[PDB]
């Protein structure tokens, strides 16, 4: 079986600034999963950030943790299976290992721990300077 | 919550070689979980490697996927909280990013579904050279 998730972006940013996280995933899992971010601040356990869901037609759900209501948004194109984190008015309290995550089981976004994800992609280092 | 699972190890060797990797755990994970370890070949899906019995102190069971049987050899340190990974004879096709993990739902050392994991230690790159 081919990797489900393959993800891109991250790096250094100062404080203010913006950067977008990207992650594609099989035909498959994309249809048939809950797309979700997490990310693991040093020494931390990783913990939700935000999530979407496929709705009839265009539509879409989005649903986001209160440490990011506001700065993020989340978005997903299903011409590219692909799933976007823009994030803005990043402090140096959003330094993290940043993850993407699939839940096959979940239909509507929603907080989600850890323990029910089925597919992770590879963690990428955001670094965010004062 | 602090993070669960620290491993330490990794790098390039050759064909034939031997490294051992290791693990550290809450005391809370360690005498509560299966753990055990997966790795994620070049574009490729992460699959079971390897798993111990919960609390291995002077008694656990080992089991072991088919690919590393007789090779690759699990053990912990209670003292230390560690459980380590032993590879013998490493081939080019064991080359992969190896991962440690926790499930708190199984106690007795069997095959590991990476849907069921609760917690995961950060993916460390281990090469063997032709």
């Known amino acids: 079986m081919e990797v489900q998730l393959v993800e891109s972006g991250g790096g250094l940013v100062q404080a203010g600034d913006s950067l977008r996280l990207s992650c594609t995933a099989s035909?498959?899992?994309?249809?048939?999963?809950?797309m979700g971010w997490f990310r693991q601040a040093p020494g931390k356990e990783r913990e939700f950030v935000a999530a979407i869901s496929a709705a009839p037609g265009t539509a879409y759900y989005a649903f986001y943790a209160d440490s990011v209501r506001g700065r993020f948004s989340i978005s997903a194109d299903s011409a590219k299976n692909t799933v976007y984190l823009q994030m803005n008015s990043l402090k140096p309290e959003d330094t993290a290992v940043y993850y993407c995550?699939?839940?096959?089981?979940?239909?509507?976004?929603?907080?989600?721990?850890?323990?029910?994800?089925?597919?992770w992609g590879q963690g990428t280092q955001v670094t965010v300077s004062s | 919550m602090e993070v669960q699972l620290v491993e330490s190890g990794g790098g390039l060797v050759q064909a034939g070689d031997s490294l051992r990797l290791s693990c550290?755990?809450?005391?809370?994970?360690?005498?509560?979980?299966?753990?055990?370890?997966f790795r994620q070949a070049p574009g490729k899906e992460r699959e079971f490697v390897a798993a111990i019995s919960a609390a291995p102190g002077t008694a656990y069971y080992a089991f072991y996927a088919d690919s590393v049987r007789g090779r690759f050899s699990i053990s912990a340190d209670s003292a230390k909280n560690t459980v380590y990974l032993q590879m013998n004879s490493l081939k080019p096709e064991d080359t992969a990013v190896?991962?440690?993990?926790?499930?708190?739902?199984?106690?007795?050392?069997?095959?590991?579904?990476?849907?069921?994991?609760?917690?995961?230690?950060?993916g460390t790159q281990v090469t063997v050279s032709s």
């Open positions: 035909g498959r899992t994309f249809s048939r999963a809950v």
């Open positions: 995550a699939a839940d096959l089981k979940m239909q509507v976004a929603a907080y989600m721990n850890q323990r029910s994800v089925d597919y």
